[PDB]
Design a protein around this nucleic acid. Sequence first.
DNA 1: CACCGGATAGA
DNA 2: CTATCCGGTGA
Length: 209
Amino acid sequence: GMACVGRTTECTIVPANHFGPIPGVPVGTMWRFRVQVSESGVHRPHVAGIHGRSNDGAYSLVLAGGYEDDVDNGNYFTYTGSGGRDLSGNKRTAGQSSDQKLTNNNRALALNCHSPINEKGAEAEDWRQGKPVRVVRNMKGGKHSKYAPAEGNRYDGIYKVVKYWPERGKSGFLVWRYLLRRDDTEPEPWTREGKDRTRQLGLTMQYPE
DNA sequence: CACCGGATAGA
DNA sequence: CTATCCGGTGA
């Protein structure tokens, strides 16, 4: 029975709208379930792929399979916006049935790219100067990405939005697409250096209390 | 494999 | 107060 559980605690360490790493939660951290990832402060939303405010930016996101148009390339990846979906019947997921829009989190994520928001898409010159995004990789990502962890969720660090643009997805409907490049001072956790570090810090899968 | 709570933002 | 939702089940 994790399908309906809520949080026990919460991150206060830093606020809901903190951009960047949660201090002393290092790259390689593991959580069995999404609720634990919320409690860490690394990705507050329970279910949603993106955490963001549409007038400020996106703080984090999760690569979980979920969306056929995501492409995961490790040190970079193309992420899909949310929405364009009929969730009637109190559903949480479905295949695309309408065009996505530059609103809400899709818009939030756009704001992270170092370039004025633009309805047709934009790219950053100094991408590194755009706002940071904490990236979490989940195991359901592994049907198609070889970077996804075997089990649960993993903090892989800060990436940044190099570019964003709209185009039709596999479904035929418009999707918002986001190129993210890693900008983190610490090794990727699927790397030997990262695996040593994970071990060297005693990181282990965090299961529910 | 139909559909539940809960966490958040935005109105 | 209401809409959204890359989860996670019991079966």
